[PDB]
Amino acid sequence: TSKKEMILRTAIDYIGEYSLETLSYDSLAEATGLSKSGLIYHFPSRHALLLGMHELLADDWDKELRDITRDPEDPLERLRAVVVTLAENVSRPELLLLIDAPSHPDFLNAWRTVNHQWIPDTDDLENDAHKRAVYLVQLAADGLFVHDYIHDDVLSKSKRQAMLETILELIP
């Protein structure tokens, strides 16, 4: 789409294949085919680029959730949408940015709104069994999301689906 979005998408793909560390105007220019002058025109600094990458992924998720949520006002339907979107294995770039987000308050802030609107709260969690039952679903969904990166082997398509349905049934 946008030349600007093209740059961001290319940078995201880049860190998954190489690393966040070597993402530079030199490597991004080679990857996009644009000159450094052309890159600066849209992203003044590496910080601006990284921030743009975080905001893009956060926006992607928000749009995905809004797109499949029955009633955005119903907590249980939002939870279902979260489970469904997290049921697909996370990509390397997104997992890397998620883990690196705390490197700067700006990156964390990029994910703040989507987190606040879709992730369940933990108010009085220690004394609310229903609160814990709901968060337990979030936890299992998170596990399915990263499963293939933290286990010595991946889930087959059928087994992943079987577990998705299992998590869905765990919803109160």
Ligand X SMILES: CC[n+]1c(-c2ccccc2)c2cc(N)ccc2c2ccc(N)cc21
- The residues of the shown chain that bind ligand X, judged by CB under 6 A, are 57, 60-61, 85-86, 90, 94, 98, 111, 119, 141-142, 145, 150-151
Instruction: Indicate the residue type of 48.
Output: A
Question: Looking at this protein, which amino acid is placed at residue 74?
Answer: D
- Give CA–CA dist 114/118, Å, rounded: 6
Rounded CA gap, 39 and 37, in Å? 5
CB contact at 8 A, 23 and 11? yes
Residue closest to 88 by CA, chosen among 41, 146, 133, 35 = 146
> Residue 57 binds which one of a copy of itself, ligand X, none, with CB within 5 to 8 A depending on kind?
ligand X
* Residue pointed to by tokens 């601006």: 48
Is the Cβ of residue 6 or residue 84 nearer to ligand X in the bound state? 84
38 versus 64: smaller Cβ distance to a copy of itself:
64
The smaller minimum CB distance to a copy of itself, of residues 40 and 95, is found at 95
Smallest distance from ligand X to CB 46, Å: 20
Closer of 9 and 92 to a copy of itself (Cβ): 92
Q: By CB under 8 A, name the binding residues for a copy of itself.
A: 18-22, 92, 95-96, 98-99, 101-102, 108-109, 111-112, 115, 119, 122, 125-126, 132-133, 135-136, 138-155, 158-159, 162-163, 166-167, 170
What does each C-alpha distance from 78 to 75, 141, 172 come to in angstroms?
5, 13, 13
CB of 59 to ligand X, least distance (A): 9
Nearer to ligand X, 6 or 40 (CB): 6
Q: Write down the least CB distance from residue 1 to a copy of itself, Å.
A: 27
* DSSP string covering 31-49: HHS--HHHHHHH-SSHHHH
